[PDB]
Amino acid sequence: LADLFPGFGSEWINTSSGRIFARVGGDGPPLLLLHGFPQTHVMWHRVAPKLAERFKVIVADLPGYGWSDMPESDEQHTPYTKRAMAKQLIEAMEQLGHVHFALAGHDRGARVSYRLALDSPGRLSKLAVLDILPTYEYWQRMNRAYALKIYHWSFLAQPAPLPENLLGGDPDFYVKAKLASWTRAGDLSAFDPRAVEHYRIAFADPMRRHVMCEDYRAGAYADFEHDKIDVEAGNKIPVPMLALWGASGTPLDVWRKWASDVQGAPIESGNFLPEEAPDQTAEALVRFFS
Amino acid sequence: LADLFPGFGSEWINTSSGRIFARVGGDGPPLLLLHGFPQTHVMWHRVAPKLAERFKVIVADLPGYGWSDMPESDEQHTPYTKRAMAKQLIEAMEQLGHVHFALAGHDRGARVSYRLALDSPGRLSKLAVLDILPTYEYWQRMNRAYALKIYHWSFLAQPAPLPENLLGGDPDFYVKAKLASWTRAGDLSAFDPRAVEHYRIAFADPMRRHVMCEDYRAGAYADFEHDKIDVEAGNKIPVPMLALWGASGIAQSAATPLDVWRKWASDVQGAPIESGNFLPEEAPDQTAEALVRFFSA
Ligand SMILES: [Ca+2]
Ligand SMILES: [Cl-]
Ligand SMILES: [Cl-]
């Protein structure tokens, strides 16, 4: 497995739920970067250097993903809910002395991020969310067309062991197919092969696949109900925010229902912005967080 | 594999789209029985002998299923659309000299059956649909709750090879868990083990799994569109119809099924039966009786 973060250290950070792995580089204001599915912290490798020109950049594996430890789940999927993941990453950040920080997330990491902002806004200076709408909004949309497009939201959320059993036969196919599927190009040409190797090795472990299914189970159930409470309360995130999304993968209208200070923009890309459009993404983030 | 229809003959019936395999028994008015997913004709094994006391019963494997031939599909999944399957079965019945016949279908076969009724009502004297609502009705309702409860409609409809590959590592496990899951009790006790073996052997063939995915791809696309035309146009089936469904099955999970069917059909009766989604196996005596009574009247 290649080292894709020149000038970054490697830390295991203790929490009450298990270790969080991160790569850590730069100096200046702290900025936490959170990946999504079916990826690891490595997805930030094309943008984390430009950010580390200005910031102390902490590139963390989500609870249960990558090299982070895997807390034991329960019947309500609790450690893999975005509320619980957020709490665990807040504890991790406190081990480094960071109690007020900038945050950018992608895909499931973006879900952690906006949930963290909703639950504990005082922890964040500024928030960026990449390639998502709120969980609740995806579910509200979920008609025929959306059920076909984002079938994995319902498939991965099926009770165990249904998706686990299917995934075990040829996991390398499935993960590579998802990576390719969600890009504009429809192939793996947007990704560094060494990055793809990281994602494949993680996905090859049954215990890591189980976590991903627990994440999607939470997304179907507790995450949705948590979001529904905020929508019904009319709670909006107060933290200055940026929404970026791949134009092939409005979203600003949606976010304005969830956040009182939000700017954003499409970038021509599929759903892997930091790898498909690294310069544009790095530039939008540096300019937003600076 | 066991012979579950002791005394019935066989037929391998030619059509323009490939052979249809059927068991044939009894004597009297003609009655075609059409299985669904993930089954074969053998699902009728507990009701067909009773029906054969009153009817000439034709128990057919759907196009692409069981021992029927597998036509090569195309980009629109055409041979596995219900419209094309219905045309194919009409041709098979004409080979037997049946141009006007009774029809009962279960699950995908039921979907063949109502589409047949909408496209070619002259072919049918009476129609029974078991364990279903129209395809259009399932997609119209597909919100979060339903997407989570009937995930396989969207999973199996993903572009090839995604479901095919997922299914190839341990196909037995998947099919057996579906058979059990869809019953009232959640286990395989409602099935004759010999029937289950027919189902598992079918599912063990990758070509047969491909067909099942093409069937669901058609269900997501052309079948939905065909249905949409009918319901937007206000077309109803004029053929006298019976709708039966298991009280624990999905047709009733967020619908009143008779109310739904009355929107699609101008002369429909029906009832629930205490069962999951496999009526002819879970409640064979009740199902047999309801079918004999409806088709005999
Ligand atoms: Ca002939
Ligand atoms: Cl620590
Ligand atoms: Cl019975």
Architecture of chain A in CATH? 3-Layer(aba) Sandwich
Question: What is the CATH superfamily label of chain A?
Answer: Alpha/Beta hydrolase fold, catalytic domain
Number of structurally distinct domains of chain A:
1
Q: How would a textbook summarize the main sheet of chain A?
A: 8 strands, mixed
List the total number of helices of chain A. Answer: 14
Distance between the termini of chain A: 33 Å
- What is the number of E strands of chain A? 8
What is the helix content of chain A?
Answer: 40-55%
Computed over alpha carbons, the radius of gyration of chain A is 17 Å
Backbone structural class of chain A: alpha/beta
Question: What do you see in this structure?
Answer:
The structure is a homodimer. By secondary structure, chain A is of the alpha/beta class. Chain A has one domain: Alpha/Beta hydrolase fold, catalytic domain (Rossmann fold). Chain A is 43% helix and 17% strand. Chain A has 14 helices and eight strands. The longest helix of chain A is centred in the last third of the chain and has 15 residues. At the A-B interface, helix 5, helix 6, helix 7 and helix 8 of A face helix 5, helix 6, helix 7 and helix 8 of B. One chloride ion binds next to helix 14 of chain B.
